[PDB]
DNA sequence: TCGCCCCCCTTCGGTGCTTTGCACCGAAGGGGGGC
């Protein structure tokens, strides 16, 4: 057990410890538990307790990836709710694309990591638990933890914090050695020759041992490929460990959820992964065991992903002396894929962006969101933003940020011609169109009624009113604009009193979750010139007053 | 030395705000700054059992190329007891906005001489991040009055007065206003002569332990109506809609005659002649919008709010108010950088300047309604920030129905 | 029958608007991956 000082911890104010009771376990988990507990007690990790301690929390056991060994777990859900809050110090996950090439690499792992860190003496009584004999012939033995238990809310942060303290003397003394520290897994790379490197490792292991952290040989990797964080590290490249996608004749909601997660995990190095059609299947469902038939689109999408995954891929490592470059391509239906590299055709990693933000948006906004996601990921992994290669003309972007009323920006980027390009699908005229018909549109619904009308009058004498059922105030106003675009020629001037409808359309959306707004977008794209003007309602303005008289 | 007891507001808990990602150069500067503050006892290393956190980042001005550590204590300041109730607050001098030249001095380092109530220190925690998450976050908390905490000027108030009293009685018409970590020092001397005595104030505070502003040339921008000699239906619609909106602000503005002028269902391009009794309404309402609104007075017990609109080609209009349509100030910001193309940098610079004017005028910053997507602002704004304070803000999408400020 | 972290996709519910539904946003459900 580490001689490191313990971290003081408290229960939330006014609360007590857990008094939950043990449940039955198979008398093969019990043997493993008794083997772990009798040995944990001899090492001082746990202590026998008695009836003066009135707390308890159930125990169970799952098996480790090393198949022979078991993992002891305590269902501390009740204790966790009553335990103080913590500030978690794990801020993210290291990525292999952020590693620099090293001459010598070692991967180490601590044995019994949590059980080597002592627990606050005053807190130990709350960790009371009872290991069970089958059939309750004998009463079980009660114990308490003296070290960090697996299942308690505070154990990960306290271990991570303590591990950082223990490592800090070695890091300060050796700034030429990089130590990636993830829980108890230590990646140690350097540019030393093999002999001096192994001496530094021996010294690091001995420093850990003095502080109570063993480094068993079974988890001491010294030769490539190194198994690390779900990857394989080679000297010049890295691969993700094999991804096996489920294959089913009948899919449930839960199966599809797992499939999408695997594909998301794969998208970090496999270029071109798409999950929109498969994730669409999850919408509107109400049970994880509900069988969902794959749509034709989802089958095609799945087959495309399967083709991509059958190819071998790898990432390379980071060269700080070269620029970072991020290239984005459009995939359709609000899906985007990117690659980050420094030399052409040698990806550091890949990724995808496909979030639908807002009810109405366009490709230029979504491209901007992809750029921002990539920029944040670049800061996290490499500490700097990359130079971008974007499938958008400079004229397009320039027309966007001059016409759009919100401030927006993109960092240094170079145009790359990889169709389909990102473009604006229409642009409203800044001045009225001479010779174009002028439509005065208006819609109105009755708030308690759920019935309304949309219509228009026209300087050319045309007029129209459609009655609407199960509508809203805002829908009728969109519906009135829909009619004007529907009945007008290639050029049209439209006057509305709905700030709501003007706000949507003036942002030039090319996609919408509303089918009504999507119909409007489709009509705007087919037009040649559109001028959209606003006037205040109920002020008897020429044109608007007559169409409002008529929607009544 | 004895500390002042401080509480959070009743029913409030300390801040719990996650640290955001930082570039390599900012993490490095934070590590070098914090390890020396560690050595000098200003901060102490802490662990995860402190459940509080506040984001930390760094700025490096073109005024001085050393990195300045910035802890965004906005959440902590909102939850800290007010010091007007504690009776240790700072009064604002009305003569500051009059001066010819106001220089801003960063005096936050003077706070590190006074210790912080040991029971309040846990609320000042922050976490330094790690490139590619090689390492868990590193956590510190303050032992002294922190920079950026609103209680630091309040607690240090008595000392700073004694530090300044010699200078200000040797200079009775220079006005000094302390806001957060800053001193706003204004005079009525030649722009070079004024700088000479700023150098003397710095070296005066230096024995114990910037930005050139000119409030005289901050111009208010009113609602101007366009002047053409021929007017279309659309021109008159735009004009009637603008005046109708301004009728919520100004007094006695009329539109019925122009409203009648657009009678019928006319083409938007048809030029309509202006009636004798329509021309009068325009020039009549032109002059209501001439000179300021009557009956609008600043209330120091309410918050200031600032709206900003992008107008294109580097122009940015803004209004500061406390109640809607009761603007205490309207303005237009414009800057030259020579890049020509950065909306987010321009807006960030517009915010600092607007907030700076409010400090000079009223003594506090307004809460900004920013015409930008939250995620676009948060991706870039810290790259352009140069102030030791940070105002409150919120994000609005701002469909401009009216062309009212420009 | 556990814990903590990051990621994506979907759903739900709180907030403010010179609203009466709508858009926005954060949290929480599901999944992937790590120790
Ligand atoms: N509550 C909980 N904690 C886990 C789990 N898996 C890993 N951890 C925590 C506790 C571990 O002690 C620590 C290191 O993980 P390891 O797989 O290396 O197990 P450990 O070091 O305890 O034993 P070993 O490496 O096999 O000698 O991370 C889990 O499934 N549940
Ligand atoms: Mg281990």
Strands (E), A278-386: 325-332, 335-343, 346-353, 360-361
Q: Which residue of B has its CA nearest to A405?
A: B310
Contact B347, B318 (CB under 8 A): no
Q: Residue A327 and residue B125: Cα distance in Å, rounded?
A: 39
- Residue B266 and residue A8: Cβ atoms within 8 Å? no
Question: Measured between alpha carbons, how far is residue A418 from residues A273, A327, A329, A331, B275 in Å?
Answer: 17, 10, 7, 11, 58
Residue A27 contacts by C-beta under 8 Å, 6 or more apart in sequence?
Answer: A133, A134
If you measure from the C-alpha of residue A113 to the centroid of ligand 1, how many angstroms do you get, rounded to a whole number?
7
Question: Please, is B170 exposed, middle or buried when counting C-beta atoms within 10 Å of its C-beta (0-12, 13-18, 19+)?
Answer: exposed
In degrees, rounded to 5, the angle at the alpha carbon of residue B241 between the alpha carbons of residues A450 and B285 is 145
Q: Is A384 exposed, middle or buried (0-12, 13-18, 19+ CB in 10 A)?
A: middle
CB proximity under 8 Å: B 42-81 to A: 47-53
Reported as type and span, the H/E element at residue A107 is: strand A104-109
| Dist. CA A219 → ligand 2 center (Å) | 8
Please list, in sequence order, all residues whose beta carbon lies within 8 angstroms of the beta carbon of residue B83, skipping any fewer than 6 positions away.
B89, B150, B151, B154
Beta-carbon count within 10 A of A301 CB: 22
Torsion of Cα atoms, B361 then B365 then B371 then B372, to 10°? 140
Nucleotide nearest to A88 (CA to C1'): C4
Cβ proximity of A95 and B131 under 8 Å: no
Cα–Cα distance, A478 to A516 (Å, whole number): 8
Chain B nearest-CA distance from A430, in A, is: 12
- Token pair recorded at residue A531: 């001028």
List the A514 CA – C31 C1' distance (angstroms): 27
Query: Helix, strand, coil: what percent of chain A each, to 5?
Result: 35, 25, 45
Determine contact: A244 vs chain B, CB below 8 A.
no
Asked whether A326 and A374 are in contact (CB, 8 A), the reply is: yes
Give the CA radius of gyration of chain A. 32
Q: Does A356 touch chain B (CB under 8 A)?
A: no
Provide the sign of the torsion angle of the four alpha carbons B68, B69, B72, B73, taken in this order.
Answer: negative
Question: Which nucleotide has the shortest C1'-to-CA distance from A255?
Answer: C31
Report whether the peptide linkage leading into residue A420 is cis, meaning its omega lies within 30 degrees of zero: yes
* Positive or negative: CA dihedral A482, A487, A488, A489: positive
Residue B41's CB: how many other CB atoms inside 10 A?
11
The CB density around residue A70, as the number of other CB atoms within 10 Å, is 17
Does the beta carbon of A197 lie under 8 angstroms from any beta carbon of chain B?
no
* CB-CB under 8 Å, A542 with B262: yes
Nearest-angstrom CA–CA distance, B355 and B104: 13
Torsion of CA A21, A24, A26, A30, to 10 degrees: 30
Method: X-ray
- Which ligand is nearest the CA of A218, by number? 1
The CA distance from B381 to A416, in Å, is 27
- Give the closest residue (by CA) to ligand 1 atom 2: A150
Instruction: Give the residue from A487, A501, A492, A490 showing the smallest Cα distance to A534.
Output: A501
| Ligand 1: residue whose CA is nearest its atom 25 | A111
- What is the strand order of the sheet B211-213 is part of? B175-179, B182-187, B101-106, B211-213
- A14-46 exposure pattern, b = at least 16 Cβ within 10 A, e = fewer: eeebbebebeebeeebbebbbebbeebeeeebb
The residues near A13 (Cβ < 8 Å, ≥ 6 apart) are none
Domain ranges within chain B, ordered by starting residue? 5-94+120-160, 95-119+161-212, 213-298, 299-405
Q: Which of residues 443-462 of A touch B (CB under 8 A)?
A: 457-459, 461
Residue in B144, B159, B149 with CA at minimum distance from that of residue B40: B144
* Integer CA distances (angstroms), B104 to A495, B84, B132, B229, in order: 50, 24, 38, 48
Nearest to A535 among B132, B241, B310 (CB): B241
**∠ CA(B161), CA(B164), CA(B166), 5° rounding?**
120
Q: Which atom of ligand 1 is nearest to the CA of A73?
A: 1
Phi-psi category of B312—alpha, beta or left, where left has phi over 0 and alpha has psi -120 to 50? left
Residues A537, A548 contacting (CB under 8 angstroms): yes
Kindly give the number of the ligand 1 atom that is closest to the alpha carbon of A185: 18
- The CA-CA-CA angle for residues A22, A24, A29, to 5°, reads 105
Q: Which two tokens stand for residue B193?
A: 């002569």
Structure tokens that stand for A268 in this block: 């970090």
Instruction: Judge whether A154 and A83 are in contact, CB under 8 Å.
Output: yes
Burial A398-415 (b: 16+ CB within 10 A, else e): ebbbeebbbbbbbbebee
Q: How far apart are CA A81 and CA A12, in angstroms?
A: 8
Query: Crossing angle, helix A473-487 and helix A515-526, to 10 degrees?
Result: 30
Structure tokens at A55: 């707390």
Q: A112 CB under 6 A from ligand 1? A: yes
- CA A45 to centroid of chain Cα atoms: 37
- Asked if B347 and A407 come within 8 Å (Cβ–Cβ), the reply is yes
Q: Which residue has the tokens 């990432």?
A: A315
B192: three-class secondary structure by DSSP: helix
């Amino acid at each position: 057990i580490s001689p490191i000082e313990t971290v003081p911890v408290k229960l939330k104010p006014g609360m007590d410890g857990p008094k939950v009771k043990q449940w039955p376990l198979t008398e093969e988990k019990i043997k493993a538990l008794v083997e772990i507990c009798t040995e944990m007690e001899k090492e001082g990790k746990i202590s026998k307790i008695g009836p003066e301690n009135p707390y308890n929390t159930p125990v169970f056991a799952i098996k480790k990836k090393d198949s022979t060994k078991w993992r002891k777990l305590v269902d501390f859900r009740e204790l966790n709710k009553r335990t103080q809050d913590f500030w978690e110090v794990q801020l993210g996950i290291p990525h292999p694309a952020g590693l620099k090439q090293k001459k010598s690499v070692t991967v180490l792992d601590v044995g019994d990591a949590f059980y080597s860190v002592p627990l606050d003496k005053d807190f130990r009584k709350y960790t009371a638990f009872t290991i069970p004999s089958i059939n309750n012939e004998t009463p079980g033995i009660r114990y308490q933890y003296n070290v960090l238990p697996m299942g308690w809310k505070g154990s990960p942060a306290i271990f991570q914090s303590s591990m950082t303290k223990i490592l800090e003397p070695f890091r300060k003394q050796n700034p030429d050695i990089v130590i990636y520290q993830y829980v108890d897994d230590l990646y140690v790379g350097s540019d030393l020759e093999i002999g001096q490197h192994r001496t530094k490792i021996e010294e690091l292991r001995q420093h850990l041992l003095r502080w109570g952290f063993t480094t068993p040989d079974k988890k001491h990797q010294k030769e490539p490929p190194f198994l690390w964080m779900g990857y394989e590290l080679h000297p010049d490249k890295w691969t993700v460990q094999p991804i096996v996608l489920p294959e089913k004749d009948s899919w449930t909601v839960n199966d599809i959820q797992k499939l999408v997660g695997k594909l998301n995990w794969a998208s970090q190095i496999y270029a071109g992964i798409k999950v929109r059609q498969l994730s669409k299947l999850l919408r509107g469902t109400k049970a994880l065991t509900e069988v969902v038939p794959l749509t034709e689109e989802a089958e095609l999408e799945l087959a495309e992903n399967r083709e991509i995954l059958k190819e071998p891929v790898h990432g390379v490592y980071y060269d700080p002396s070269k620029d970072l470059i991020a290239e984005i391509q459009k995939q359709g239906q609000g899906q985007w894929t990117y690659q980050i590299y420094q030399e052409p055709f040698k990806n550091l990693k890949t990724g995808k962006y496909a979030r639908m933000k807002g009810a109405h948006t366009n490709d230029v906004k979504q491209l901007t969101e992809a750029v921002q996601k990539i920029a944040t990921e670049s800061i996290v992994i490499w500490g700097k933003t990359p130079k971008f290669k974007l499938p958008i003309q400079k004229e397009t972007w320039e027309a966007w940020w001059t016409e759009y009323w919100q401030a927006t920006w993109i960092p240094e980027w170079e145009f790359v011609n990889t169709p389909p390009l990102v473009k604006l699908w229409y642009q409203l005229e800044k001045e009225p169109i001479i010779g174009a018909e002028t439509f005065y549109v208006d819609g109105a619904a009755n708030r308690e009624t759920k019935l309304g009308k949309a219509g228009y009058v026209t300087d050319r004498g045309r007029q129209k009113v459609v009655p609407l059922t199960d509508t809203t105030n805002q829908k009728t106003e969109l519906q009135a604009i829909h009619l004007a675009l529907q009945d007008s020629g290639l050029e049209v001037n439209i006057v509305t009193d709905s700030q709501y409808a003007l706000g949507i359309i003036q942002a030039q959306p090319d996609k919408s979750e509303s089918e009504l707004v999507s119909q409007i977008i489709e009509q705007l794209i087919k037009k040649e010139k559109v001028y959209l003007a606003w006037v205040p309602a109920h002020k008897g303005i020429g044109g608007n007053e007559q169409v409002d008289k008529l929607v009544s | 030395i004895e500390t002042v007891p401080v509480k959070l507001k009743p029913g409030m808990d300390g801040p719990k705000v996650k640290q955001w990602p930082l570039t390599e150069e900012k993490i490095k500067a934070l590590v070098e700054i914090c390890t020396e503050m560690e050595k000098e006892g200003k901060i102490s290393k802490i662990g995860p059992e402190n459940p509080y956190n506040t984001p930390v980042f760094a700025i490096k001005k073109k005024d001085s190329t050393k990195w300045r550590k910035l802890v965004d204590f906005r959440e902590l300041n909102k939850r800290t007891q007010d010091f007007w109730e504690v009776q240790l607050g700072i009064p604002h001098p009305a003569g500051l906005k009059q001066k010819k030249s106001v220089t801003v001095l960063d005096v936050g380092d003077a706070y590190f001489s006074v210790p912080l109530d040991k029971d309040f220190r846990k609320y000042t925690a922050f976490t330094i991040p790690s490139i590619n998450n090689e390492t868990p976050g590193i956590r510190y908390q303050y032992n002294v009055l922190p920079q950026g905490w609103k209680g630091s000027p309040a607690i240090f108030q008595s000392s700073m007065t004694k530090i300044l009293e010699p200078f200000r009685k040797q200079n009775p018409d220079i006005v000094i206003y302390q806001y957060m970590d800053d001193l706003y020092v204004g005079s009525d001397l030649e722009i070079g002569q004024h700088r000479t005595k700023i150098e003397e104030l710095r070296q005066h505070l230096l024995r114990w332990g910037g930005y050139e502003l000119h409030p005289d040339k901050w111009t208010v921008q009113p609602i101007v109506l366009p002047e053409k000699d021929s007017w279309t239906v659309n021109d008159i619609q735009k004009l009637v809609g603008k005046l109708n909106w301004a009728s919520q602000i100004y007094a006695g503005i009329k539109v019925r005659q122009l409203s009648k002028l657009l009678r019928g269902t006319k083409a938007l391009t048809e030029v309509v002649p202006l009636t004798e009794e329509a021309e009068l309404e325009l020039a009549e309402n032109r002059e209501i919008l001439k000179e300021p609104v009557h009956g609008v007075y600043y209330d120091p017990s309410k918050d200031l709010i600032a709206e900003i609109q992008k107008q294109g080609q580097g122009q940015w209009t803004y209004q500061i108010y406390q109640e809607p349509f009761k603007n205490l100030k309207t303005g237009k910001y414009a800057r030259m950088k020579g890049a020509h193309t950065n909306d987010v940098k321009q807006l960030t610079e517009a915010v600092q300047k607007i907030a700076t004017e409010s400090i000079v005028i009223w003594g506090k910053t307004p809460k900004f309604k920013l015409p930008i997507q939250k995620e676009t602002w948060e991706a870039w704004w810290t790259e352009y920030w140069q102030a030791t304070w940070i105002p409150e803000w919120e994000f609005v999408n701002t469909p401009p129905l009216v062309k009212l400020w420009y």
